[PDB]
Amino acid sequence: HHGSTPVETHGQLSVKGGQLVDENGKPVQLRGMSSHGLQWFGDFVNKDSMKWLRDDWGINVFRVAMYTAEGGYITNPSVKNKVKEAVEAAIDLGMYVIIDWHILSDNDPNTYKEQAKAFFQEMAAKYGNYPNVIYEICNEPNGGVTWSNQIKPYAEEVIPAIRANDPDNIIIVGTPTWSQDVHDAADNPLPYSNIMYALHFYAGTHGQSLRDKIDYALSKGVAIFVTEWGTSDASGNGGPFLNESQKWIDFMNSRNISWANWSLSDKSETSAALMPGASPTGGWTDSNLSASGKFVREQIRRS
Ligand code: NA
Ligand code: NA
Incomplete structure (x- = not known):
């Protein structure tokens, strides 16, 4: 037997x-x-x-x-x-x-x-x-920096470079305005397989208007991966904004959107998951986790 x-x-x-x-x-x-x-x-x-x-x-x-x-x-x-x-x-x-x-x-x-x-x-x-x-x-x-004139052309150079060596693994492409403007990508998507588009949000700064852009993008048939989000404001301060973060987590669950939280560090940002001096090799108890880390850990442990 083994852990799956x-x-x-x-x-x-x-x-x-x-x-x-x-x-x-x-x-x-x-x-x-x-x-x-x-x-x-x-x-x-x-x-x-x-x-x-x-x-x-x-x-x-x-x-x-x-x-x-x-x-x-x-x-x-x-x-x-x-x-x-x-x-x-x-x-x-x-x-x-x-x-x-x-x-x-x-x-x-x-x-x-x-x-x-x-x-x-x-x-x-x-x-x-x-x-x-x-x-x-x-x-x-x-x-x-725009989707049609800067980012999509960049992706059209990098995607084939990856694909020549790795035909099938997923490639995630960033979007304008710190990976917020997924609607621009949805309106002019890359016509290649196994591509996703990044969305980044910070719960102290972003709310329903950004969820609306995401729902629009999904309606055009593109796939969205939240490769980075924080419980802080966009600058890394304040909160953590746990009520708004929960609304975002419930939205992502409802839309089956994958996500990664920033950050696994003890940086002096309220988004950081660890208290100053926490062990770099893991083994953290509750007191080694910041207010943000405690919340994020709880949310990942849920179903
Ligand atoms: Na592969
Ligand atoms: Na990205």
């Missing part, structure tokens, strides 16, 4: 009729955690903390936020070793893993598109045969 794992249970994921489904074609919802930036909080990303999250929080997906700028991969490519550590841990543990090319201050994904293609080609060649892997090719386009 998410990948053992669900295998290769795909997008069918605008919905994430498993190898049996049955709907599946991933719920898990995102790291903070690997260049700052990578110590919290390892096989022990991922196993603890799987066993104690019930997560089935873990997202590694590999920043490009801000001391990330472009200037310090050694952070790729932490991505590889996390992917290999996810394989060992039967977990899904999101490899996130985490643009932010570099608000146009085209700025580092050559590095992105080479990085994703390497990851897809090494790990593309494993069902665990999900690619997230540009975290948050922002600042007036």
